[PDB]
Amino acid sequence: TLRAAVFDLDGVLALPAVFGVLGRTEEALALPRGLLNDAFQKGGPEGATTRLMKGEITLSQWIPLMEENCRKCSETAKVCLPKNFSIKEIFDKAISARKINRPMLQAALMLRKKGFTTAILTNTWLDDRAERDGLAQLMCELKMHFDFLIESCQVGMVKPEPQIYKFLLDTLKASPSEVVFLDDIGANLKPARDLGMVTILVQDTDTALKELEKVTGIQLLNTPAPLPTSCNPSDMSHGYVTVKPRVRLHFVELGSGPAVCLCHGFPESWYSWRYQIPALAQAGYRVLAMDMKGYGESSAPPEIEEYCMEVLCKEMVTFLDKLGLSQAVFIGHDWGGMLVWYMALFYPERVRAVASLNTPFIPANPNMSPLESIKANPVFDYQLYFQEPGVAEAELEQNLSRTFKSLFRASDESVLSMHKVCEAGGLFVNSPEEPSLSRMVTEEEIQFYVQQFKKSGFRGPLNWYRNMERNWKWACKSLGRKILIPALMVTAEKDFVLVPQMSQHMEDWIPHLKRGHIEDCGHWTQMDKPTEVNQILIKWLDSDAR
Amino acid sequence: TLRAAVFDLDGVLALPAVFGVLGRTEEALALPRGLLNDAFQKGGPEGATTRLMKGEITLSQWIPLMEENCRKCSETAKVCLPKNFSIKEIFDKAISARKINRPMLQAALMLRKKGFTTAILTNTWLDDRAERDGLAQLMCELKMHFDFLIESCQVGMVKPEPQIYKFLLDTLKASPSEVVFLDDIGANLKPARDLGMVTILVQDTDTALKELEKVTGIQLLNTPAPLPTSCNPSDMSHGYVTVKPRVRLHFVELGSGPAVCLCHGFPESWYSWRYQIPALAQAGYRVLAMDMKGYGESSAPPEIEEYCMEVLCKEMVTFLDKLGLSQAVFIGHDWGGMLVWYMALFYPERVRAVASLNTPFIPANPNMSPLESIKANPVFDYQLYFQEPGVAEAELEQNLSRTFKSLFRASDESVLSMHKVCEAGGLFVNSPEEPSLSRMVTEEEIQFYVQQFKKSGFRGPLNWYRNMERNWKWACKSLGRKILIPALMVTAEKDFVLVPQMSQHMEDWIPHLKRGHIEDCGHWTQMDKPTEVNQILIKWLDSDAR
Numbered sequence A, B: 001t002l003r004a005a006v007f008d009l010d011g012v013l014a015l016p017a018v019f020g021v022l023g024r025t026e027e028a029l030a031l032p033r034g035l036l037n038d039a040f041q042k043g044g045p046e047g048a049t050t051r052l053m054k055g056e057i058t059l060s061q062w063i064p065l066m067e068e069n070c071r072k073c074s075e076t077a078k079v080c081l082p083k084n085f086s087i088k089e090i091f092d093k094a095i096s097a098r099k100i101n102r103p104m105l106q107a108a109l110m111l112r113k114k115g116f117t118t119a120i121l122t123n124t125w126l127d128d129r130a131e132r133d134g135l136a137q138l139m140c141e142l143k144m145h146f147d148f149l150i151e152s153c154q155v156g157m158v159k160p161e162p163q164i165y166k167f168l169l170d171t172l173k174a175s176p177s178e179v180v181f182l183d184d185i186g187a188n189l190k191p192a193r194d195l196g197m198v199t200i201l202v203q204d205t206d207t208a209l210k211e212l213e214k215v216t217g218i219q220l221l222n223t224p225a226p227l228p229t230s231c232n233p234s235d236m237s238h239g240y241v242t243v244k245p246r247v248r249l250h251f252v253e254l255g256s257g258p259a260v261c262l263c264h265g266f267p268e269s270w271y272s273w274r275y276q277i278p279a280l281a282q283a284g285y286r287v288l289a290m291d292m293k294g295y296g297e298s299s300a301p302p303e304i305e306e307y308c309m310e311v312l313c314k315e316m317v318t319f320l321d322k323l324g325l326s327q328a329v330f331i332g333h334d335w336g337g338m339l340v341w342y343m344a345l346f347y348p349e350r351v352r353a354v355a356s357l358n359t360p361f362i363p364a365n366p367n368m369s370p371l372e373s374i375k376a377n378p379v380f381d382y383q384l385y386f387q388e389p390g391v392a393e394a395e396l397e398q399n400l401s402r403t404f405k406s407l408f409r410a411s412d413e414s415v416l417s418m419h420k421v422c423e424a425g426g427l428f429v430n431s432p433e434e435p436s437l438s439r440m441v442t443e444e445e446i447q448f449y450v451q452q453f454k455k456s457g458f459r460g461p462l463n464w465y466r467n468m469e470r471n472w473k474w475a476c477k478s479l480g481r482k483i484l485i486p487a488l489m490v491t492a493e494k495d496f497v498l499v500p501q502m503s504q505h506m507e508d509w510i511p512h513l514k515r516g517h518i519e520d521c522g523h524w525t526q527m528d529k530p531t532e533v534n535q536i537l538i539k540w541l542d543s544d545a546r
Ligand SMILES: CS(=O)(=O)N1CCC(NC(=O)N[C@]23C[C@H]4C[C@H](C[C@H](C4)C2)C3)CC1
Pocket: A266, A267, A334, A335, A338, A359, A360, A382, A407, A418, A497, A523
């Protein structure tokens, strides 16, 4: 019975194949059929291409050798190579044109999710071209979805030599009968077959996947739309910056390019952006997913005033200073969304662009107490419950698993009614002791939040709500200003606290404001609708933030 | 007696002043003298410029108000503003033209080094222009050299209002008589004088610095060339990546732009690059200064084979994978220089560019044992002493302070003779018990290395020398290759181990190789000649690495 799946790169995980480019070049230049492909394979195992595939020579060293083989081939075929014939040009173009075959990767992802050991076995070269980064990026994106990547040029062995197959089996720790092997080259598939492995000759992806699902007994074709890539906390780069003597800020970092600072809500973690971190990095950005003050690995001082917007924003500026960042794009959700509008109002020179999920920008009312304002809205009643130091902590800290299972629910699974929370004396007074697992979260994801909250609890997080008068006074200083930097407001249809209509008057203060809207989405935007969050954010980043 | 120095930004720490641009614009456009400067200050404390300087409005909100004042001024002066008159254009150009007045910053740096509390007190605005990043970068570079930065638009007070002076004194925790205040505007200097502060009207920098050194009794003018900015370990962003189950890699990170990976030598730290980290970040690069395997906060497994070049390089590739980096420029010194040439030979697609300080690239001799090769060179004799597990550890770990004080010495201070180290039975057998402090290092810098080495000692670091046969076998696989990616070789005149002549045959393997050479420089290149290392590296990075 099968437990491992092996995939080739060219013509299997990446399309179009390089072999298909040499053929297309012959057709385009009106060269004799197979002339280029013949020069490419000249001398077979003793040839320059074998030396290249084994790692004896680099791609740049190979270009002149291929040129000589092409001249030799044209001499025998009694033909002439065109005036400006260039192998460098042909290969640069071929390599650049090659993209990931998404449904093949999806099938590999599914087999791995169902327990398979997945591997990439490829005949490749050591790329030293000026444009090598494209291929490096491709390999980077691909390799992280697999248990092993076996490259001919690194192992000094090549397909179809029998030793590379015995090497593959040794790294898989699997007998041939337990392995599926997919290849577009019949000759390279032959030694795997001879060893007793299940083999698939890949021509078109659809037929290959039919053969693959028939042989594994796992649905790979016509499958539901998959979730975006998530994060394994232990595989991330973890960063730490001291912003002041008793305060350290933790963050997870991924990708290269313009700095994108992610700011979570209450009661969350850097991990609330797990479905956005890989996507934004992949889109050409350097992601900095924060553990906000009072959360996870960041410091959680006990004093209420350590959590007023003025100090939180100042500390985020210091965070940029210490990292050597003159700017970052600030993307926030919930309480993070509020911080982010305040970063744009008080430090526009430090904010490349600003985006908020669910949280609208509403200017302070100088004629009314924030206490009065909160009482005017019945959904904002649970905020009065959060005021008394200790009361909400005791309930939230009592059973951590219960807390996150009760809170982190999709729009159609609600267990909480935020009207009369004070009257009823708590958020979970009509919630079960053992809530069911929401469709948005796995048991393991809940246990990550439980472990994070075991360090500091709910004092620091609840203190974000305990600075109303202080935040109101500070916000009143910005009443004459406008947000004129690039800005995005994302509303969530089914968020019954941060309702889309609460954002209706935003253009009076943010005239150039851009919008996004997510149908059938509750309060937990990022995990509720990850695919659509990523699509809105990426489109806005490439257009307005660079 | 003086203990604090306060500096204005415009016309003091940054030149040319904005006031000087409005005047130059009038002259260039043949406008009535002072017309623009008059519109700029229209309405005084009730005017739009005061509202802007107090943070009531942003710069973009101010542009139209300045335009109305300019129209009003031209109406009264019975003149006409030109066809395409633009305040946005004038101010963009002015702000962009403004650079740091380096000798003023140098004097501030010296006063701070001699115990002074330094501060920037400036009348400024909340910048929301599309081109605000330039100014953000300027402020970033400047602010880190001072104890305090007081901005009018953040405090809601403005010069020359007396309250900002009383605010300045409160943040300095100093009485007026203990403060020097430098300003280019006489009116803004007047309230500081009235309070009893020492004041300096800054016209030309030279005269201002003469007044400043005369009043402080500290040499600020005609001073020796200063060292580049160094790092305070506790003010850095510290990163951690798990590359495999028992191995974690630590790094310090600073700046934005192309990733530059710094790789130290034996027996060093990320801190050996302290004079390069701020400089390279300032030059437009994202610096990743490594704690190499076996050092500081990185894991130090005991097994010898965990330190062969093959595993060290593979782990550096994984480090890139986990950080989401398709490429980095690799800059190495000593053992780090060797790793870096091997990263270019085995993973060119991952290396944007490669640079080595002191360490040459010498291909393996397939006809000779690395043991034979090391015996052929008498300077490489101390390497035989390092072979026996435990012997060199015991001597190096005996007294940590002695170890670093004995090793980290300039070319004219040597205490070690590496010929007959085995015969004499140790590196420090003719070295004093209490070595003097070298001119290159402070006592505090030695104590940083002592604390770092207390965690894991010398086993892991010495294990880098214990893989000769393994490294030789692996290197022999690359004998047919060439380094064809951008490459820099930096030689140090007075390095008596890694002598410049050892690098003489490098173009046979690296044809496009670029060179740098440092006169009167020993083995500890980075701290020996920091200014010249930074100049060579920055010039090569901007030309060949982007
Ligand atoms: C001042 S504001 O309007 O920006 N703002 C900050 C964010 C806050 N968010 C919030 O309170 N979220 C929760 C998240 C869950 C669900 C519900 C109750 C409890 C637990 C707090 C709303 C609403 C008010």
